[PDB]
Symmetry: D2
Subunit: 337 residues, 4 copies
Amino acid sequence: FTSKFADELIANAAYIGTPGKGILAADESTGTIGKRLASINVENVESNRRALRELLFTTPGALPCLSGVILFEETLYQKSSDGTPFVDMLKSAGVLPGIKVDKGTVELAGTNGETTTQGLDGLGDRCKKYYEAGARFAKWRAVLKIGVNEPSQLAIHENAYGLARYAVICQENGLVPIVEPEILVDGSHDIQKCAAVTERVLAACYKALSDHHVLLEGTLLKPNMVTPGSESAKVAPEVIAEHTVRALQRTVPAAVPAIVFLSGGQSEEEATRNLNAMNQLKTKKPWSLSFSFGRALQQSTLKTWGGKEENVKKAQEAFLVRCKANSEATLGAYKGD
Amino acid sequence: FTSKFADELIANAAYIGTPGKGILAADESTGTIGKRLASINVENVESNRRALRELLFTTPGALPCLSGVILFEETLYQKSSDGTPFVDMLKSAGVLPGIKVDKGTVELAGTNGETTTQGLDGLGDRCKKYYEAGARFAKWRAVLKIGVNEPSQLAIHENAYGLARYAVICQENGLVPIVEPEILVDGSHDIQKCAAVTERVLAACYKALSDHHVLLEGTLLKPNMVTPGSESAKVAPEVIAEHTVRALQRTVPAAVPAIVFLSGGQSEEEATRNLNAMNQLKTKKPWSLSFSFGRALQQSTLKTWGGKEENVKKAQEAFLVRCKANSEATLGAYKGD
Amino acid sequence: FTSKFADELIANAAYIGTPGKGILAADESTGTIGKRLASINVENVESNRRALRELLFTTPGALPCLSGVILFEETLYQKSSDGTPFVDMLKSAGVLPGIKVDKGTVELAGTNGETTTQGLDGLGDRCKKYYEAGARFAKWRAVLKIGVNEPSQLAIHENAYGLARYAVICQENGLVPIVEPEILVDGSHDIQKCAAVTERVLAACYKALSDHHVLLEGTLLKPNMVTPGSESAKVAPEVIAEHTVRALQRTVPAAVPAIVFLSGGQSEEEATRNLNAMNQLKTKKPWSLSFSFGRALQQSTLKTWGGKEENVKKAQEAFLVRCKANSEATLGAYKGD
Amino acid sequence: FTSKFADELIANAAYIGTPGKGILAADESTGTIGKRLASINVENVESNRRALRELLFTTPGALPCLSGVILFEETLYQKSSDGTPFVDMLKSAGVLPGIKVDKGTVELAGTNGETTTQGLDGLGDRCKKYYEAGARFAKWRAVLKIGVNEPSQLAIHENAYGLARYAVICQENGLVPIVEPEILVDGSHDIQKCAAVTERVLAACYKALSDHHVLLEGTLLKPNMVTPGSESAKVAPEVIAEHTVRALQRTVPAAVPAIVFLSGGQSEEEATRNLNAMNQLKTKKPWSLSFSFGRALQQSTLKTWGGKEENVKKAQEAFLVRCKANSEATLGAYKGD
């Protein structure tokens, strides 16, 4: 398998990992963004979703910190207040538009609330329409949990091979697949457990991608950082960095151009600090270590904004703060704000 | 000497050397651009200079290939057709605006047509106005020639210490100085001679910068590539690369973040190919090897454009071709057109 | 799985990959060395085997080019003419002694002459005795072939999991396992085929090693270079290098410290030139690229020596030539004889 | 200036900077070693100096940690107890023998106790004899002090140009020159002052080496680490590392293959820790950062070795500890002992 998009996939995937840049995940479904809007007393109508995404995308200074922005299908075709398609707004600034293509998760019978991710049906034709609409990368999220018997062989197998198949289809249709095998932080396991599970899961995913003949140079990885569980004592950025980078060195081929971490419920500042520490570690890292943050990029902007329009300039200043901080983190040059 | 701009100088100088980006030198005076406009039957009025710079700067896809654009003073204050100041147009795309600050050359008594560069008088106050107008780097060109007795000790000394003093003033006023000691190609000397002269000159320049207590991590170097003289047989990109990188390894401190080659006499394609070969050399290179090209970036765009407006879309496609090619060259990934 | 030897394994595996050094494979059994001795009219008695190994190991200048020497069990316990144990001779020069621990190959029923490698029975106790005798690394050779239906899923699976189990036992007993999945060069397949098969095989091997909880940082890889088949047209070193390094980038974790190529029927000079080209390639290589050569290091020495003792000084100068050339090749600094 | 030794100079200088290796400075004159021997109640006769250097050089395990050993003229021609010439002992183990060639310092009139280094007279003929005796590198120590008006322009100029001229003569006779501009720690100045003085001194030295047409690729630098003065509070290894590496980045061309730090006033453990921290700094370092230690390698060995021969095995185990620790420090892998 050589795609006709092979050169463009390799160029775009490498571009996403440009030092100083990372990805804004703005791909929250109509429901998920509902929750976010609720959490700051705003109705979930298309009026407000458009307003919020426009706030982000027209923040002075923000787009230059961004190699990519993950959109939801609605937003991919939406225009701003002045009739500018968001995808053009992105492109003008050198930002690749991305598209969430998974159709969410379902529970696996005979497991303890483990899931598999849906979305392969008609995915080829979707990806082609998305490419035609200006998308150049894709997202698919697989979710694994840590427990006594988790993640199970079945959960791993299903999620790895679901990611691999998604990756091929993406590449056939000119979209760089972000491979996202998220290991949830939930629990009182220690960082060593997280490390072992992350190592096992990534090794399963790269084996699957090899079996599916995926062009690794035309892909991205969006893994969790290796951290203690959500109920365990927090640990310094340097400890997160050591464990995380060691896990990646053990599993992720050099052919992969960039690793764009998910924040997974870490605070805005903590996510930045952890990423920074990874870029300050003197060790073999044959991939860019960057960000693909949603909540960790938007949380404080959502709050400053609240509802209406006096707080746009203030919320845009807040958004710039986090974009700039994460950009600095990719270069290992974040000093704190 | 610690500048209050020290952090911003270091961040901006590092930014210019971002993999995938380089500098467009669009800083040709009112007269020099006249020549270029003449050469394609366009009158040299402010109407057309603005139109040409706008053509370049509003090329879809081009700005993302550019970490910086060197402007002439006129262009620094000019706006586009839609009222956007060029410096804002550039910033929105993450491009640093730069300013040519030298006042040209004068001949040195007692030499064989060797020059020194003028421009120190009132330079501080100029740089400060330029900073306030949105400029964040500066350019000063010293010119050296190769002859039986050239470059002379006097020419070298004058040009190195003129550059050093310019560099300090720049940094005091928040402009990253591009240090440009251009060794002209004119003559029948071979590449070995060029190498020895380039090594001598750069060693003189870094000595001067040390004596002037310049913050090297807040500077840039725009040297000639090491090539045979104008009357000698041209040589393969691999040979240009070997001699050039060896010269830089011998002279340019690792503290300097990036080396942005001038194109000099070189064609569009030749400049790209030579830069690419440098980025394919596996050797210790503690600086970004990038581009600061004028004619090598504009030549084919100037021609396609000709005069008027049906040839804008076509000329912008031509400009994108060269921007994209040089961007690929900074990554060592240029495969040819 | 944490070994008590973990720190020493990681230090020794990293040591083998020291730039300027590689491995001499002198581990040919009593029969195989018989063939080699025959091929230059010498009887296969313990007298001569000792004489030949002593010739190699007492070559002025040779041992400094060697981070390791793979021995056969006989040689591990043998002394030189003057009562110096070879293992002390090696250690004095900073050379790690290694031990061949596989018991050869057997054919797999239902395949077309594909093999699996034997030797797991009592391997733990062997490795412990070998460690006590001064061995610090081990060798196990798996063999895969290329054909219409080869290598088969069964061959791959058997060889990968045989290597993995061998690797853990090694590490439990303080021997750095060289993981050697040799894909035989035999056939008229092209280099693209070799690339695809090498990529599939290595991916299967690292999956197995992960399943077996092997410490990658305490291992080595001895793969075939990626080459056209033995019956296909030879190609330039730079082509071998491009395909080989690409295959390794796609499959071998950064955690592995070093890759010591087998020569696999290449000539002395060709092996050196191919290794050199790999170290001249500007590309992400998170491991040392070195040599583990047998015939490619000894062939010309065997011949110069012949049988008799007038040709020792001459044969030792020949051996030094190849040691020195391969040492230079590890640094990318080999220019030809 | 092209030496006939140019290839061998470049290969040997690069060899000295092999990761995992550094230099033992055992070159203390008849007087200086007197002091060391006195300090542990041993008479300064050639009997005992030989015994001490033999102790070091015949330590099981030590030589593999060493790319070079700097000798005093006496030791260069000495043999061990068993008739083995030291230079053969070194070579057998892959260690380059080096020779101290300066003839000590003299005071500069019109300065405040500043010195210049002697030794240029007949140095060519000495270097040639030394090369013939098996030496392949050389050492010359310049001494600078830090005061209100020190180091003076005159002291710097004299020492830089003395080093440059020494370097040329070395290279003409096939010895890699170690350039050693030692800035003494004496005083109450802070680390920032040491940094500024080290940067000024090194910049003067590389300017001089350029003027003298020295082949940088065939040289070594032995500078002080950047530290607080002798009367100021000691500072953490990370702070030493940051200031030291920054000073070198600012001044030492990439063409120089290795920087072999002098230990100066530092303890064994402190020297190792500081070196290690430099190799753990994530920053552009286009040279090997290694060691050329005297006191920091020998101090604890001198003490364990009382004078008599029952304490040799114990003192050799102590010497191995420091060799092993510094070797690990060159790799950034020292964890403490």
